Subunit: 405 residues, 2 copies
């Protein structure tokens, strides 16, 4: 009976997160089989719900992307009766996840000290902009602001050009991945000790840690980084090249690969040229070498280059737009297009799970919940509320229930 | 109880190279796992030769992502080397590799071979595009993957050539996926008592990260475009040039927009019909950004940081490497981590992103030298006597560093 079972099956997660960093972490935990309870404000809900267009039905595409495999309960945390519901859920929930500014939930009585009293077992994870404490800890967390402060924006952009930001909020997504792993570490710690712990995850720490070798260049060698566009500082040639109909990324990491690229480009003279004999020589003569290579790539179409580079064994790929990405058979074969049946919106498609496991499949996923969709169900079953009290909560406005259950 | 780490007592057999794999095992090493790093004798990990910057004989690239590990140099191509890996796998909980799909299977180190001897083992494979597929045989590279996955297409200046992120965020994202996924396997193994196979690849990680942007095309049939530092739906929310640098300032509602306008001493803009609402501000984006940009250039970045203090609106400065680690918050978070390398001396690398209440990860073992723990691992983990170790050393199957 244990042949085909998900790892986080039987783990209840109380999710109070909003926007992207938090929901992406709980979504990936939901794929692993955990039961995720999403707490939202009555009427408005998660901020992403209003982030449209694009709007499909009454649901924004932003919200649907990162909120699958969750159940929604609408509770007014500011009301004292709402605080009681959250505490009661915490008693039966293994994990507590929030992404408010430090001290906000504590001011409302939902802080870790408050939750620990009723749920000492609970794994409390807090996602913030800059951390629980510090001089700038009170500032709210924003992806673009954090990438600027953390220094990623400084090193991203065209050479001798203005800084740019990554297209998607990679700082937010990286923090969500840090937390998604950290929460599982808390569960492993919980099994041994029998007690819960507090987790601190923040955008600043996530992005700085990702700087890795680039930051180590300054910490150890006192070397300041610069923007390189699509090129690499230490490897030449390794950049995107403009073509007749698009861009192609071609790289050579050694003389064997460089000779292969030159032959495909019909430029054998470069192989034995003294300026390009070695990688260090190629880096020193980067400006001249790139100009010669760029002239060749422009002469032919991207499709012809992909045909010529087939089986080359060197790094090579095309810059793909959204239409081209999901046209790729490899993307489809990996299951990256995930389709789910939304109760009121119909069939919808979002990016699928990145990770695939041999023992179990995560292809079948629950669609993102409507605002307050499971409010009455969670109260009646999980908290054993009678119908009379639920109606009183509904009339007062403490909780909100959607038309569709 | 302090000094109690979650993954303490978990042995990880690490055959990864470059960045994606080592970043995953490094974070597992911080959590208390015993990470055994298998490297080629003579050459070692590819990152070792990726210098300058070089400190001593170790590249800064290698040192950044290889702390909290032990190094054993084994020749997997030799049949005697294959036996050593199999013996280690029997006593190791986790097996991690990042070779091209099918390469280890040819050498006898594939999942089927390891599963027979170590059914408990958790096997994690990190590849460019996945275990199977039309382009699965292609090797994994960050710049190539970001181009194919579509991240490069949406990153860059508006009406400008595409650019790539400064760091290999696709590789690091995949490493973060694996580090979480490996722990998911351990939790499942505790219940079932048997191991499983994990597939992690750069393409799947980056595409999944596209998230709402990909959902716009999949659901709304909308094609994305490059926005520089600006945002498509929110104006103003971008980096602004200053007298000495760049500052990022954003306003998400009319109240925040009024706050920004007052700080910039442009109150007339608040009540202007062209900028009354966010939708109106988006429509007149070109005109509004020009007016705001002219004001930002007049003053120094530090003056703006002083004026925006306590404003409550999104605001931050673009920091270079010197400014990042100059920030007190970065130091307060423990992000500067120092360890004592035996031959290189005291060194500093970026610290762990996550901090836990029960245990501390501040003290870390320094990155190992090539083949530093070869004799120790063979003698202790596999109970090899001195006689057998010498025979492997003479043949060249294993390599031991001068420093132990």
């Amino acid at each position: 009976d244990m042949n085909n079972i998900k790892p986080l099956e039987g783990v209840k997660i109380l999710d109070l997160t909003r926007v992207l960093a938090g929901p992406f972490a709980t979504m990936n935990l939901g794929d692993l089989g955990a039961e995720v309870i999403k707490v939202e404000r009555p009427g408005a809900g998660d901020d992403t719900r209003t982030w449209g267009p694009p709007f499909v039905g009454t649901e924004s595409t932003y919200y649907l992307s990162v909120n699958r495999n969750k159940k929604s309960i609408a509770v007014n945390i500011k009301d004292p009766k709402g605080v009681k519901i959250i505490k009661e859920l915490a008693a039966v929930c293994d994990v507590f996840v929030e992404n408010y500014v430090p001290g906000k939930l504590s001011a409302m009585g939902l802080g870790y000290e408050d939750i620990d009293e009723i749920a000492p077992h609970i794994i409390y994870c807090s996602i913030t902009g800059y951390g629980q404490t510090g001089p700038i800890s009170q500032r709210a967390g924003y992806d673009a602001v954090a990438s600027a402060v953390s220094g990623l924006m400084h090193i991203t952009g065209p050479e001798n050009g203005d800084p740019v930001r990554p297209g998607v909020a990679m700082t937010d997504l990286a923090t969500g991945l840090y937390a998604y792993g950290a929460i599982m570490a808390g569960l492993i710690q919980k099994y041994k000790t029998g007690k819960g712990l507090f987790i601190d995850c923040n955008l600043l720490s996530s992005q700085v840690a990702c700087l890795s070798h680039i930051a180590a260049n300054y910490l150890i060698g006192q070397k300041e980084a610069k923007r390189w566009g699509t090129a690499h500082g230490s490897i030449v040639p390794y950049q995107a090249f403009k073509t007749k109909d698009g861009y192609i990324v071609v790289g050579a990491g050694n003389n064997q690969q460089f000779a292969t690229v030159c032959k495909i480009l019909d430029l054998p003279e470069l192989i034995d040229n003294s300026k390009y004999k070695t990688n260090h020589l190629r880096v020193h003569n980067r400006k001249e070498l790139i100009k010669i290579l760029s002239e060749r790539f422009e002469e032919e179409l991207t499709s012809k280059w992909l045909y010529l580079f087939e089986g080359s064994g060197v790094p090579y790929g095309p810059i793909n737009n959204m239409k081209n990405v999901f046209a790729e058979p490899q993307v489809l074969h990996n299951g990256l297009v995930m389709e789910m049946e939304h109760p009121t919106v119909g069939k919808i498609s979002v990016p699928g799970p990145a990770v695939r496991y041999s023992k179990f499949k995560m292809s079948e996923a629950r669609p993102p919940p409507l605002l307050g969709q499971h409010t009455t169900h969670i109260l009646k079953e999980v908290l054993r509320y009678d119908d009379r009290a639920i109606g009183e909560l509904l009339s007062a406005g403490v909780v909100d229930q959607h038309e569709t259950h």
